[PDB]
Design a protein around this ligand. Structure first.
Ligand SMILES: *[C@@H]1O[C@H](CO)[C@H](O)[C@H](O)[C@H]1O
Length: 33
C-alpha cells in the first residue's frame, strides 16, 4: 500500500494526510519513500 513506516492519519477538523511512524515525517500528498 504505502512505503516503509508510512500510514494514513487525520486532523481534528476531518482533514486526511500521510504520516511516517518510524521517522515522524508527514505529507498532504501520497508518499513514495
Ligand atoms: C485542518 O487542520 C490542520 C491543522 O490542524 C490544517 O490547518 C488543515 O489545513 C485543516 O484543514
Amino acid at each position: 500500500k504505502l512505503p516503509p513506516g508510512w500510514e494514513k492519519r487525520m486532523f481534528a477538523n476531518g482533514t486526511v494526510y500521510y504520516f511516517n511512524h518510524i521517522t515522524n515525517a508527514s505529507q498532504f500528498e501520497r508518499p513514495s519513500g
